Amino acid sequence: AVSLDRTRAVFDGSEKSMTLDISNDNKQLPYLAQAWIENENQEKIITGPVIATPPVQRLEPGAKSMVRLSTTPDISKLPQDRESLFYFNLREIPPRSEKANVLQIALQTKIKLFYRPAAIKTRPNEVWQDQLILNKVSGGYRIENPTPYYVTVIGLGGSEKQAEEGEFETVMLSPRSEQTVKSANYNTPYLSYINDYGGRPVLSFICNGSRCSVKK
Amino acid sequence: KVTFNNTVVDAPCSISQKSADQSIDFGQLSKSFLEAGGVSKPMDLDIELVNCDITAFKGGKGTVKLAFTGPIVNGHSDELDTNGGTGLAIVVQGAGKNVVFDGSEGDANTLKDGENVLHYTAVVKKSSAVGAAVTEGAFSAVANFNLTYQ
Amino acid sequence: APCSISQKSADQSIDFGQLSKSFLEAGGVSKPMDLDIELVNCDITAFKGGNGAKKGTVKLAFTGPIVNGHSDELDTNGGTGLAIVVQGAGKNVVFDGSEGDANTLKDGENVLHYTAVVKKSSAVGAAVTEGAFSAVANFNLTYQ
């Protein structure tokens, strides 16, 4: 019954706080909405550096509310030249059932929460994923992500259509890191990723041997 | 001049069921029947995915991991332990596969073309716990349907 | 001549915020937002240089990129599926420079009130995609 407004959240390091919108899409009954934060290993963290409030709140039928994301002085201890990964959780508590012998379903929405330091603040439709480098290797490709941001790759094929509908195993590269994925060799490699808005753009590469850079 | 600004994002899924409290009632059951090894009629546990683009749970990869979570009958992650000390447990079947609640990935693509409802069935039965015995009394349970977006 | 646009109305911005791709693609329409044109220091009294001047009326016209087949939809810069629709007196506005209805003006200042919304365009094949969007419209006045 309770829902979040996005699939990922970017926290602007130049800000000390920001909000996320939540909704009780159930028009008949009130539901509770709990919110909390997890670190990069998805372990719940209560002492910062990012905090979620309120930890729980009641939502009347059809009610719209929000959750606030705030930072603590320790936020400045996070690296300031790359992104840091967190997870935001929103889980509902349906009202206790009337009937006896019942099973109830409770939805929990978990999304990536990227802490983006001010030094790498970004512009409205900016693209950095075009700096991804593809190195052909034994078994597939070694994706290289030299950018200071996390990049979520959801496709890799010989065509644009194959990059999208292709059967690929979604992997997320950490800032300044690489990673090898198993894949068939392609003449004109195509890659698909998830941007800040949830969009899935498709990047076309051109290879110079075992190296492949995005085509501008 | 007037400049209009807006932003568009992909929204996470919202769920709902035939019942406003998101529950399914198993009705009354015979303690003796369940005790003897009988099982309840499998009940339709349908979850409607709304306010999102279902083109990620469809059938025919996935950027949204799906999983169920709840207390389990020790040694049986596919048996959702219940409340009421009745000795009963709940089992949920998805699409030819059983759901596990120890926090293991479920099938996030069980959507039958032309629909936005994930279909499951749930049955109540005596717990697989050693020396378990069905006893009179109402039972209940809550399972967490977890959607983790990438 | 009779009036002059207020410094604030001559160059204004409207932010509809963050919208759901799903909502839009399924025909959803955003919350409306006020778009007011403030005319200040109007001297309709002095607009007596030939009483042919049908009262102190003013017709406003909007101009901007348009969605094919639909002149009442302002096209969005970048992207493809979105469209801005502006209303006045419950009547839609067209962005081809056509004069709107006559508005009566009194000396001093007058406010022309409109409301705007974002939605998927009526164009065939129109597909809503995510990202940041912006649309710009210009307007000009003609007095009667």
Residue numbers in the entry:
A (entry chain A): 1 to 216
B (entry chain B): 10 to 69, 74 to 163
C (entry chain C): 20 to 163
Relevant lines from the article:
However, by investigating a different PapA mutant with the additional mutation T101L, we obtained crystals of a complex containing one PapD molecule and two PapANtd1_G15N_T101L molecules. This T101L mutant was initially designed to fill in the PapA P5 pocket. However, this T101L mutation had the additional unexpected consequence of stabilizing a complex containing a 1:2 molar ratio of PapD and PapA. It clearly shows one PapA molecule bound to PapD through DSC in a complex very similar to PapD/PapANtd1_G15N; however, this time, the Nte of the donor–strand-complemented PapA molecule is bound to the groove of another PapA molecule, and thus this ternary complex crystal structure provides a snapshot of PapA before and after DSE. The core sheet structure of dsePapA is in a closer conformation than that of dscPapA, as the β-strands on each side of the groove of dsePapA are nearer to each other. Also, the “63–74” loop is ordered in dsePapA and not in dscPapA, as this molecule is missing residues 70 to 73 in this region. DsePapA is only visible in the electron density from residue 20, as its Nte is not interacting in the groove of another PapA molecule and is thus disordered. Figure 3B shows the surface of dsePapA bound to the truncated Nte of dscPapA and that of dscPapA bound to the G1 strand of the chaperone: the PapD G1 strand interacts as expected at the P1 to P4 positions in the groove of dscPapA, the Nte of which interacts in the P2 to P5 pockets in the groove of dsePapA. In contrast to what is observed in the PapE/KNte or any other chaperone–subunit complex structures, the side chain of F152 has moved out of the P4 pocket of the DsePapA structure and the P4 pocket can now accommodate the N15 mutation (substituted for wild-type G15 in the PapANtd1_G15N_T101L mutant to prevent higher-order polymerization). F152 in the dsePapA structure is allowed to move away from the groove position because of the T101L mutation. Indeed, as shown in Figure 4B, the T101L mutation and the insertion of N15 induce a rearrangement of the side-chains in the P4–P5 region, leading to T99 moving out of the P5 region, thereby leaving room for F152 to substitute in its place, the new F152 position being stabilized by L101.
